[PDB]
Design a binder for these strands. Sequence first.
RNA 1: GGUGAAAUUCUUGGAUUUAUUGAAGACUAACUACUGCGAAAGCAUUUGCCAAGGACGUUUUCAUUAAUCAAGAACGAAAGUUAGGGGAUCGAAGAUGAUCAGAUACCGUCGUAGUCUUAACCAUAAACUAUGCCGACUAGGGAUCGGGUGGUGUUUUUUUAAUGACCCACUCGGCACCUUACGAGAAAUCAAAGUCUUUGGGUUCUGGGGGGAGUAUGGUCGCAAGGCUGAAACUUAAAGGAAUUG
Lengths: 153, 127, 91, 81, 97, 214, 97, 25
Amino acid sequence: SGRGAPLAKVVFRDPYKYRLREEIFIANEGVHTGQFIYAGKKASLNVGNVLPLGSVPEGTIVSNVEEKPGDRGALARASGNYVIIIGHNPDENKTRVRLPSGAKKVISSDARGVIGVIAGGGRVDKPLLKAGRAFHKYRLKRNSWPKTRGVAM
Amino acid sequence: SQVFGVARIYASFNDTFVHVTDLSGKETIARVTGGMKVKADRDESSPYAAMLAAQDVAAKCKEVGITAVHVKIRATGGTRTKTPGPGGQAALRALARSGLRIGRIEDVTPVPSDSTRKKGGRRGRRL
Amino acid sequence: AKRTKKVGITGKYGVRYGSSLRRQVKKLEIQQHARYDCSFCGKKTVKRGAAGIWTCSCCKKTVAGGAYTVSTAAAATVRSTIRRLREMVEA
Amino acid sequence: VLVQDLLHPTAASEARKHKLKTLVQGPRSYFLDVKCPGCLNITTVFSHAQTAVTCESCSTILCTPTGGKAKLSEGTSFRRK
Amino acid sequence: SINQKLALVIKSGKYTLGYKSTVKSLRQGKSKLIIIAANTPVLRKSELEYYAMLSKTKVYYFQGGNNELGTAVGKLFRVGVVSILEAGDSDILTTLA
Amino acid sequence: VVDPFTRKEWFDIKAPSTFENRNVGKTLVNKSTGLKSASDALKGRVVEVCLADLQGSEDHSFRKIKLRVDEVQGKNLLTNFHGMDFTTDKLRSMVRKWQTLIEANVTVKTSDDYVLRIFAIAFTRKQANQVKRHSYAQSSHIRAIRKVISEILTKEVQGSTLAQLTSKLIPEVINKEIENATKDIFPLQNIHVRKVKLLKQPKFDVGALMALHG
Amino acid sequence: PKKRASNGRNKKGRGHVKPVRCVNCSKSIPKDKAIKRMAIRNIVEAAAVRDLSEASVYPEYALPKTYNKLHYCVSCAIHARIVRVRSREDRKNRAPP
Amino acid sequence: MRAKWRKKRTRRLKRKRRKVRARSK
RNA sequence: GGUGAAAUUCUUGGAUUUAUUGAAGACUAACUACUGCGAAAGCAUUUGCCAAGGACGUUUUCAUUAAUCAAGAACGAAAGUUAGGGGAUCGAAGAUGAUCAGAUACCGUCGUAGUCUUAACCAUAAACUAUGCCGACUAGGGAUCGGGUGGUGUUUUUUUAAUGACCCACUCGGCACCUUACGAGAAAUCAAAGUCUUUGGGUUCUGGGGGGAGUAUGGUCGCAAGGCUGAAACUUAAAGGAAUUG
């Protein structure tokens, strides 16, 4: 609640002890309960997996991409949005990427990011329609609604 | 068995350009436009400008080391005209006279495989 | 009989909010309350419980989908791109 | 032209014309009896193909179909019956 | 391509539609062939394949879902797997495997 | 006031072994000044030049071949095949009314690193003793030729680098197979190879280059 | 009651074909109408042919031709190009010279 | 005057009359 | 840069200009024709998949199933409109520099809508062969696209086989053309505008001097722009169409 993109509760086996430690990504569009999710360096380029940015080609669509190595999500984490890796800079291992604003960025290839779009795209296509709906949206976010116009006060 | 060059004659309507270069391409020697020599400025593509500047090119060209020169020929092309300008022949004969030997020639106009809307309007340019 | 002419599902809003807005909404509300077909069990049993989440009524799989449809346009193309981009690395 | 007989024309000026625009309409499709390579016995076949016919007993290819008349494969003799 | 075959098969020799019935057929030995749908699940698939390797029944994977596999076999309901017991008028055993 | 024309150091570039003679390129770039040594600056540049100039045979005026540099060895360097074209005028001579044009290509690979496109061409002649002016192609036979030609383009490459390719190109023995394969399909005429160009360039590879001296 | 009016005259074509802009004046025009000419000349003129030949390295040399197809807009064709205007009988004839 | 422009002259005056009448309704 | 010539304009805070690369849309050059398909509107790069359709072949089958058609209905260029994308050239508006007595027009330099596409609408066009559709019959001539038939024909491989490609003769279905008028027409022109005062093969639609007016009103479809249907008073001796001189 307070984030139109639906979440994805994933569960891996911890390497260093007998137990199931759980993680929670922002769900990428086209994943299903009990689909496997492969992660890391030699993972496949199938929707849902979390590969380093050196390992992907160019023209590749990922989301939830880290700003730098091991910050655990940073960019393109909104409902519908996504990044496009648009070429390597293989020396001093960076990669040049297309952020959802439009503006570009240069970030480490060791920064992981998850493959695909994010779910709940075309959220804002519908009108919010009546004040009530807006209220309902905002009361699960914070108290920055409604807004009195400065020129009135 | 002597040193060579390449000319690349870009002769358009209302200006002439013939700049001899090295065999690679990037190493240029003398640019010489249509409007450099004569200062009338409606005679930019005229014969007498193009014959004048063509010798001037060979002057600066002899000053480094050029004996022979290929003469590739170009126009504005693409959307526009795509037919050689008036001063190209003026250049060719002039440079052929002034000192140099003459290597091979061919056409290198930017001829489209159809591309974009042409400048003017649909009903066209009229007077 | 056939109950209304054009509003359809948006006639719940009735007289209000402007026509263009009503129609605009209707465009989606049909898709929002559509029963879609499952990719797994192959019956007309997929619905949504909150925008983004798409449930199978039998089978009981849950797919992460679009706001108002299961496979939004942009998503559909992305997979194809990736599907194609996997055939330069492997085969 | 002007004055002539159309009842008895000539075979020269009639065999040239189309099947439908003769005096009495008649086809240009004889029947042929092929002697196949394998067996010694005949196969009664229509000159135009439509389908790809194989032999009666020892089933192997006889005549393939084309845009018009049947394409009789390899060296195989035939009759007009 | 393949539909043409099953249309003929489904009205001359004999067949079976379902999963339990297919398993039964597979156990006894009557199973000549199986057609598994593409959509039908992985566990069920592997299961069917395991029986197949023991009975030595030839395995076929359909190119189409369960709705499609119904459409092919002239039935107005879905069918995730179709096992064959007798190839009658058609000759669908050696055409594919 | 500068005078920067003469201060540039003089240079010369020589062709690879798989042609006939090496002596072709005579150029200038710049002296090895403080920052930007001219040895690495000129590597990227190429020369387009006629085959008759480097073959020793004046009949082949058409086809100006493109050669890119990689190594430098004391201002007297070696170079390796980059690309090829026909001369623009030659194509325009080839292109006529009352006939059919047939063009095609394929992204064929060599034995190694080098991957490239090769653009083939063909035309339809007034076969032997035609009364009609044109002799147009059928148009299923145009695509059916394009297929055979494509196949030829494919199987004739995946061979030993530019060494075999360039060799085949110089006298164009590729044409003969294209001719006799197509001969039964359609009479045909001209039959050349318009263009060749590198979609995938080589990666450095000094062993292939520097082992090509006279 | 009811009463009104008019209409007019004729020529032939085919169906529809895409236009090709005028090489001189950028007016749009189809290709049944068209008015086209083949510009087929040497690079060198009659005056330039000697001066070059003398200065030419290579024996025999080459001397290629600049080929190009030029399309006019009828308006511009009459402004300069060989088209002019012919009599009642001569406007039926199609022979060039 | 020309027919093409006459048509326009009509049209403009028609959609003026549309407002003029619809002021009452 | 740019023209008829000038100017706007951008210019060593390297301009135009050649060579090496990259990015985005753009359109399928030349070949491309009295050439090809589609009911039209309209469609030109390669390759694959999805159905569809013509002609042709046919001692295959069906057996009057059909010809046109008020109502009603699919498609329907270009420009517009609706909300996303895409947004390079060209470019309603607009700004401009000239031009000129004036120029908000032609000529220039930029430039928002658009041009492109997604899902919706829209229904007009000189939507033109301003020539309804089906059927029959009448003049010659070649040339061509697509099958088909035959010929000890020529050409191409592996002399030879098979096809393809040609050549020849013929015949079906077309895009059309050349020559006459045998006829037709007010002529121009027409192989159909023919076979119609010697007036009748079947059928649909439209027009009855010009304007007023394709306006007004009323219906109807459309978000709108507009679309379909569609008068009146009143006015007027000619409008007009072909040719003929000048």
